[PDB]
Amino acid sequence: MAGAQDFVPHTADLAELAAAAGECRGCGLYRDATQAVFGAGGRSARIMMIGEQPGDKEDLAGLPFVGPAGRLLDRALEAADIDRDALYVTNAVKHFKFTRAAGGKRRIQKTPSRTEVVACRPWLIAEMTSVEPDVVVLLGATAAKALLGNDFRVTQHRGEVLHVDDVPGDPALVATVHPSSLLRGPKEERESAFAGLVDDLRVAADV
Ligand code: SF4
């Protein structure tokens, strides 16, 4: 077995899966991170949302999407008329990957390698098989690539309803921008990008 696969227990119970992920050594990222950050939500959710990895705040909160990026996504979900009872939100990698600077106000997130994404993917498959979502929203390049291939380009397929035969349960897949990209740039570009994120979320909610 490769990566996290022998660390994943034979259960679909999300509490048991989350506990087991706390003991995962499927790649090196568990060493420096505070804790594993599993997904949040319930198995009745119809929409699954996948980001890249927990960030500085999530690493310590023990919860996904608790910082500025989470607040922007919340603003977008509200504008797309998506109830939070319908969501299961998680990340492609479950340990924060980072370095620090000397005068930074945060620990600096680093990009997971394809090896780490592939190593952690067993947790994502377990989450997908446990929740059985009707649609999976892929927030950013790392998450999209995790399920759609290392060559996939979000910018080229944003907001298209995709279906790949290798994904368990054949949910609809919708790739979109990662909310953290929307925190930067000119006001009108952020406003334009925010409306496009809402669009992609509305496509997913209409699956
Ligand atoms: S990032 Fe994923 S595969 Fe790597 S140790 Fe953490 S939970 Fe396991």
Residue numbers in the entry: 1 to 207
Text from the published report:
UdgX excises uracil from uracil-containing DNA to concurrently form a covalent bond with the resulting AP-DNA. Structurally, UdgX is highly similar to family-4 UDGs (F4-UDGs). However, UdgX is unique in possessing a flexible R-loop (105KRRIH109). Our earlier studies allowed us to propose a reaction mechanism of UdgX, which involves the formation of a covalent bond between H109 of UdgX with the C1′ position of the target deoxyribose sugar concurrently with the uracil excision from this site in DNA.
Substitutions of His109 in MsmUdgX with Ser, Gly, Ala, Gln, Cys and Lys showed the loss of its covalent complex formation with DNA but gained canonical UDG activities. However, H109 substitutions by Gln or Lys, showed poor activity. Further, the overlay of all the structures of UdgX H109 mutants showed that the overall structures are very well conserved with a Cα RMSD of ca 0.2 Å. As anticipated, we note a clear difference in the sizes of the active site cavities in the various mutants. When we arranged the mutants in the order of increasing cavity sizes (left), we noted that the canonical UDG activity of the mutants increased with their increasing cavity sizes to begin with and then with a further increase in the cavity size, the UDG activity declined (right). It suggested that the initial increase in UDG activity (H109K to H109Q to H109G) occurred because of the efficiency with which the water molecule could be localized to make a nucleophilic attack on the C1′ position.
